[PDB]
Amino acid sequence: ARVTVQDAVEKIGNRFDLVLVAARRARQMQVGGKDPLVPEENDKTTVIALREIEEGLINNQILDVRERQEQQEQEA
């Protein structure tokens, strides 16, 4: 469990678009479309998204290429 946002601040210096992107990540593993990439500790999707972005696993480029991906499959 990690509720402090310092690592996410360092990874994303704006730390404010950080909120938006982590919120989107949480929004689409909370509802189907993607699945958690970090082991669940009975955590809410907010903090698992936060721990994802802390590890550098989720960044703006990665999330946008991933999302454009799920579209080109959903039209296909």
Binding site: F16, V19, A23, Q30, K44, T46
Partner: protein, 1352 residues
């Protein structure tokens, strides 16, 4: 469309109005307000306005089941989804055009101004009173003129085939249909090329401005006359009938019904070809009904009983209180929230709050239901309801799951600063109160006295993450007002730490050596070694060095056992210089600040939580207790008292002896009792400081007192030297009714008893303070409101604008004492230039680098007087502010970024300490208190005989630039100051470098010769009396204030000529020779009296201090923010150049200032109430004082420049807040000022009129465009002007702001006719519309949308 900003308001075209609606209401039927059945057809129609009741048939008589979401006509109904219900709206196609009353009753009558006749003509024709020639007869008749009935006839029989004249709105329709706006614009602009008349050009420019405004709005004038009337759905307007004899206002409904009745009657009459008079009358009351519909406030407002609210009309339904009803008061109560009294939980971690189990169970019922049906434990909502109400043990696991990390938002009932609402992780607890984190309640500015906190649950994912990243107290530990932690240990934990870290001189466990704090903990918790002992411990402390590595330095340290036990708390990478010495509140503030600035946030939050736990635990183990033997009564208090009564008895005996005046012995007794109070407090504190004395090995030794009351306030737990001074010693002197000090102090303590009269007197102060508290709370709320309104539309949106402009930024020093260090100010700013060393031109800092702690220290060691820094004032960013122009001083320690409306932060930071706002030297002799080089700036002085560097005027400054590279003493040199010291001369402390008469100011002559009574009439302008002691006279110049018309046309003057009988003048000095005598200027020298250089010319009595140019307190803050004239403005030199008098006292006095390269006639007005300091033939420059006294900010901006008034306002407000000790970073004042002077008046016309209030950012963009092309327009020269906070607020470019908070109909009409495409930059405006705000995460979201615009 998507949730956007930059919304466009314009006048609607009839075709697209018809496009909005679907069908027209046939007959109007309305509820009777005693029968609530919606009758159809009418105002209630489920085919045009959408289904009033969805999924069922409604006609007022029909309730059949059939159309439950399917499109089909059975009696005339249409049933669809609620989305169609919202968009389905009505229209009625009027046979005749109808005007809109708002553009008629408005002071700028849009029809009147566009058609260029007074509004009387338009109201006459619209009210069906007098005809108007609609482009009718022109050969002998007039194309556009009003006609009475007989004149209209006379024209008709004169001509009927070339003449047309109608009545009402159709006439204006025909008129406005005629003009081709482009032809008018072209002809006017091309005429302006030929026209050479000033007034004619003004008129042409005004007309072309209006025409171009209508052209750019894209609105055809024919549109603004209502051809088809759109009508709301019934549910979109206020309607709430009450049963019985009492009802509610619903005038909008029957106004609709009346308008439909009138239109249907007119349609019937026109279908039957009714005669002209009857149809004209029908159109007349149809127009009247439509106008009453549009407004009744244009028809005359009135007050109705039981409701301080006018009669309902569509215009009044536009705006109620406090504005748009659903976006502010009243009253926005919201679900998923609770409210409860608060208790302390000292076990919760800093990111946690203790929340009652019942409160959680009822705050998360939907989430609990979702989980329960998710686990299969419930099959329906009913089963979930039963499952939760039965309070079974299973729901506890469910609630633990839904609360595992779901945070909650706690807000104090008044939120006076940003921290007033903070997130926490809820821990489910037994009880019925919210267990708030003890260390956060100080930030909440709350207490534990029955006051109730409020919880809310951000319940969507994205709100939760907004809470976690921003709202939680962990991420918000520094005050957003001045930086610096706001999470400082306040009263209990600080007591525990101060106890545990104290030392003694002898206790069990003294002197030994222990293996790290390991053995310190082991030995103390054995009770074998006392917590306090001079002990050598081999500690291994970690230091951050190199690129961020940790070096473990192990050394033997002389400390105390408790201090090592505490050192266990501090994480690695911190020095041991912090956890030694008795830790006070300021010491723990320093420790947390250093931890934040050296390790970061996570070590800081862990350190704070652990130090809270340890402070509480060791406060408990201390048993620090307050009794009555602990408070110590000084043994000699009564002796000092009795001495005081003896002294006052002698003084009063002299009083009855007639030896001292009333004020004399009053002040004597007051001073005696103040001295007695000081002596008593000193004795009490001396008793406290070493009340415990302990032997070491036989000899007694002082040491920090074990006395619990001494720790009780010395730690800064709670209280002060004043308070523990007034418990054991006397609280003494205090004020009486009328707010004056009583002769006899409150000579009794609280440990000793209080006499009845003493307590009675003391009650006055308490009552006064409580009333003051209530009034200040109300006024602080109001001030926060106005400041937020003026500052809210201000968001950092750009990172760097490259503006090398900035402000001089200096350590503020008054007199000999440096009030604030430049070290404090410089922190968190960005330099506007590259600073050098005080000895060499070497570059110390790079281009516009952030000046954080390291660079601030580097500037401290290389001591510097001033730095130019990037300011939001100097910022050239438009619709926003450069980040580097701002700095980063926030709850963060990194450079600020885009978003984050720092205007609101500034407003709440200025309003937060508002509650704390409460309601040998200068003018005698300047005594420099430190040794350093003497420096004089802006001298008005000529070196005369006896080495006299006699400085005149108040524009001269005495700095003390010492041998370090910056100043340490600052003084203001008064008029006629005599100085025997030169520049760069080392001076002893308190030595009179400048000396003059304290209680009167002389006019020291810098030249010698004959004295001429110039511009005088003996016995008319001066008093006639000569008392000769050395060739002197007792002639006194009459007061500056207004006098007779034969004594105010010549101003008395003493012309001083040389020793040759010839006139002489000295350029560059505000003392040409002729001292023009102000009021009460006793003339010392007669005509022809010979004097030396350094002799007084005239004497003007002064108070030797005590001038009243400042009032202080929150009203002072407010009137500076409103920029009000302080006891009328003190005029400055309106331009550089020679000066002279005009027509003196014609109204008031006139002063011509004659530039040598400018406009010579430049006189201004001089009220005789000002203290005049102005001569003729003297050379001045802008900013030089001409009338002495308090200067208004308006003239300061107009004359000295933008940055000058910036510094003035910043210094004034910062000094006022320092008077209460509150420290606020000045970037907030800078942004509030940049809001204040956001409007400017053009001097030399450009793309706008010659003088007008214009957004200065618009001035920048327009001038940049002007140099972009070759053809200059014009131009353009401008001067910024300071509007008041309210005036600047109502000056907002976005009309959405004004719609909710000022008069509305005129503002809305201006927006419509001008077609104002407001950027919707405003935040509360985005609240008003109902969309995301452009700040923080919302700004980032809209930025992402814009990035996705034209990228899809």
């Amino acid at each position: 469309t998507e949730e956007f900003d930059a919304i466009k308001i314009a006048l609607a075209s009839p075709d697209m109005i018809r496009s909005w609606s679907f069908g027209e209401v046939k007959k109007p039927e309305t509820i009777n307000y005693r029968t609530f059945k919606p009758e159809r057809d009418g105002l209630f129609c489920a085919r045009i306005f959408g289904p009033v009741k969805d999924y069922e048939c409604l006609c007022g008589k029909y309730k059949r089941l059939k159309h439950r979401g399917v499109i089909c006509e059975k009696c005339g109904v249409e049933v669809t989804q609620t989305k169609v219900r919202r968009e389905r709206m009505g229209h009625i196609e009027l046979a005749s055009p109808t005007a809109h009353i708002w553009f008629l009753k408005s002071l700028p009558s849009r029809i009147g101004l566009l058609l260029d006749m007074p509004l009387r003509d338009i109201e006459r024709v619209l009210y069906f009173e007098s005809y108007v020639v609609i482009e009718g007869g022109m050969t002998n008749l007039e194309r556009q003129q009003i006609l009475t009935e007989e004149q209209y006839l006379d024209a008709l029989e004169e001509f009927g085939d070339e003449f047309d004249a109608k009545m009402g709105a159709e006439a204006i329709q025909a008129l406005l249909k005629s003009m081709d706006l482009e032809q008018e614009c072209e002809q006017l602009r091309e005429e302006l090329n030929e026209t050479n008349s000033e007034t004619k050009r003004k008129k042409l420019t005004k007309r072309i401005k209006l025409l171009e405004a209508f052209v750019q709005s894209g609105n055809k004038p024919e549109w603004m006359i209502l051809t088809v009337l759109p009508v709301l759905p019934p549910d979109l307007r206020p309607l709430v009938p009450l049963d019985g004899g009492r009802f509610a206002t619903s005038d909008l409904n029957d106004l609709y019904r009346r308008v439909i009745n009138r239109n249907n009657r007119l349609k019937r009459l026109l279908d039957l070809a009714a005669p002209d008079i009857i149809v004209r009358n029908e159109k007349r009351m149809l127009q009247e009904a439509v106008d009453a519909l549009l407004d009744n406030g244009r028809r005359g407002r009135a007050i109705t009983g039981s409701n301080k609210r006018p009669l309902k009309s569509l215009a009044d339904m536009i705006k109620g209180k406090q504005g748009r009803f659903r976006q502010n008061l009243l009253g926005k109560r919201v679900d998923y929230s609770g409210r409860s009294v608060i208790t302390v939980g000292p076990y919760l971690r800093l990111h946690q709050c203790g929340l009652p189990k019942k409160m959680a169970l009822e705050l998360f019922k939907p989430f609990i239901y979702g989980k329960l049906e998710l686990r299969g434990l419930a099959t329906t909502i009913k089963a979930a309801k039963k499952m939760v109400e039965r309070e079974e043990a299973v729901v506890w696991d469910i609630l633990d799951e839904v609360i595992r990390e779901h945070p909650v938002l706690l807000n104090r009932a008044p939120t006076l600063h940003r921290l007033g609402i903070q997130a926490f992780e809820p821990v489910l607890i037994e009880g019925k109160a919210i267990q708030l984190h003890p260390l956060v309640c100080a930030a909440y500015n709350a207490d534990f006295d029955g006051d109730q906190m409020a919880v809310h649950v951000p319940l969507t994912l994205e709100a939760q993450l907004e809470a976690r990243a921003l709202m939680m107290s962990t991420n918000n530990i520094l005050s957003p007002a001045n930086g610096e932690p706001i999470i400082v240990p306040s009263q209990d934990v600080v007591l525990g730490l101060y106890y545990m870290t104290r030392d003694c001189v002898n206790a069990k466990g003294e002197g030994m050596v222990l293996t790290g704090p390991k053995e310190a903990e082991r030995l103390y918790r054995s009770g074998l070694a006392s917590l306090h002992a001079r002990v050598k411990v081999r500690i291994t402390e970690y230091e951050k060095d190199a690129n961020g590595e940790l070096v473990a330095k192990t050394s033997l340290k002389d400390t105390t056992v408790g201090r090592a036990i505490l050192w266990m708390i501090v994480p690695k990478g911190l020095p041991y210089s912090i956890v030694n010495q008795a830790l006070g509140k300021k010491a723990i503030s320093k420790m947390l600040n250093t931890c934040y600035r050296i390790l970061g946030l996570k070590p800081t939050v862990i350190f704070a939580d652990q130090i809270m736990y340890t402070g509480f635990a060791y406060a408990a183990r201390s048993g620090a207790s307050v009794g009555i033997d602990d408070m110590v009564i000084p043994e000699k208090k009564h002796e000092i008292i009795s001495e005081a009564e003896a002294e006052v008895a002698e003084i009063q005996e002299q009083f009855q002896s007639g030896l001292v005046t009333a004020g004399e012995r009053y002040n004597k007794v007051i001073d005696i009792w103040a001295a007695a109070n000081d002596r008593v407090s000193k004795a009490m504190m001396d008793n406290l400081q070493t009340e415990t004395v302990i032997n070491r090995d036989g000899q007694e030794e002082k040491q920090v007192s074990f006395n619990s009351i001494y720790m009780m306030a010395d730690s800064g737990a709670r209280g002060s030297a004043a308070q523990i001074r007034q418990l054991a010693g006397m609280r003494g002197l205090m004020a009486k009714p009328d707010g004056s000090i009583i002769e006899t102090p409150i000579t009794a303590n609280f440990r000793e008893g209080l006499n009845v009269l003493q307590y009675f007197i003391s009650t006055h102060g308490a009552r006064k303070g409580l009333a003051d508290t209530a009034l200040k709370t109300a006024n602080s709320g109001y001030l926060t409101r106005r400041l937020v309104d003026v500052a809210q539309d201000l968001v950092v949106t750009e990172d760097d604008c490259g503006t090398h402009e900035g402000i001089m930024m200096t350590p503020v020093i008054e007199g000999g004492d440096v009030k604030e260090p430049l070290r404090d100010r410089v922190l968190g700013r960005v330099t506007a230039e590259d600073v050098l060393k005080p000895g060499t031109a070497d570059i110390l800092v790079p281009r516009n680098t952030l000046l954080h702690e390291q660079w601030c220290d580097l500037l401290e060691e290389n001591s510097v007087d001033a730095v130019k820094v990037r300011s939001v004032v100097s910022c050239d960013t438009d619709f926003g502010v450069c980040a580097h122009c701002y700095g980063r001083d926030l709850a963060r320690g990194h450079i600020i970024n885009k978003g984050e409306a720092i205007g609101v932060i500034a407003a709440q930071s200025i309003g937060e300490p508002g509650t704390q706002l409460t309601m040998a030297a200068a003018e005698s002799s300047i005594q420099v208190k430190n040794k350093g080089s003497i420096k004089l700036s802006n001298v008005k002085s000529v070196v005369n005989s006896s080495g006299k560097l006699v400085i005149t005027s108040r524009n001269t400054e005495l700095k003390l630039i010492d041998e370090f590279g910056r100043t340490k003493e600052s003084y203001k040199v008064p008029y006629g100051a005599v100085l025997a010291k030169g520049d760069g001369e080392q001076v002893a402390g308190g030595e009179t470098v400048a000396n003059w008469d304290p209680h009167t100011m002389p006019v020291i002559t810098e030249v010698s010769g004959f004295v001429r009574f110039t511009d005088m009439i003996d016995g008319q302008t001066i008093t006639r009396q000569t008392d000769e002691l050395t060739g002197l006279s007792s002639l006194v110049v009459l007061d500056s204030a207004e006098r007779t018309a034969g004594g105010k046309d010549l101003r008395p003057a003493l012309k001083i000529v040389d020793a040759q009988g010839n006139d002489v003048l000295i350029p560059g000095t505000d003392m040409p020779a002729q001292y023009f005598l102000p009021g009460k200027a006793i003339v010392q020298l007669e005509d022809g009296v010979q004097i030396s250089s350094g002799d007084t010319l005239a004497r003007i009595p002064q108070e030797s201090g005590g001038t009243k140019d400042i009032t202080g307190g929150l009203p002072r803050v407010a009137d500076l923010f409103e920029a009000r004239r302080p006891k009328e403005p003190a005029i400055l030199a309106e331009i550089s150049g020679i000066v002279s008098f005009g027509k003196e006292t014609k109204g008031k006095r006139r002063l011509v200032i004659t530039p040598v390269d400018g406009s010579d006639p430049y006189e201004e007005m001089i009220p005789k109430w000002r203290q005049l300091n102005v001569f003729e033939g003297e050379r001045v420059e802008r900013g030089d004082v001409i009338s002495d006294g308090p200067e208004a900010p308006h003239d300061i901006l107009r004359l000295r420049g933008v940055h000058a008034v910036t510094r003035y306002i910043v210094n004034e407000v910062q000094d006022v807040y320092r008077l209460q000790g509150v420290k606020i970073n000045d970037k907030h004042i800078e942004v509030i000022v940049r809001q204040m002077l956001r409007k400017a008046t053009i001097v030399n016309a450009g793309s706008s009129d010659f003088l007008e209030g214009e957004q200065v950012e618009y001035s920048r963009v327009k001038i940049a465009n002007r140099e972009l092309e070759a053809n200059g327009k014009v131009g353009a020269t401008y001067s910024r002007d300071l509007l008041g906070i309210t005036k600047a607020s109502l000056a907002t470019e976005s009309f959405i702001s004004a719609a909710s908070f000022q008069e509305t109909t005129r503002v809305l009409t201006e927006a419509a006719v001008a077609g104002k495409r407001d950027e919707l930059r405003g935040l509360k405006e985005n609240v008003i519309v109902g969309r995301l705000i452009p700040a923080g995460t919302g700004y980032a979201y809209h930025q992402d949308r814009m990035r996705r615009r034209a990228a899809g």
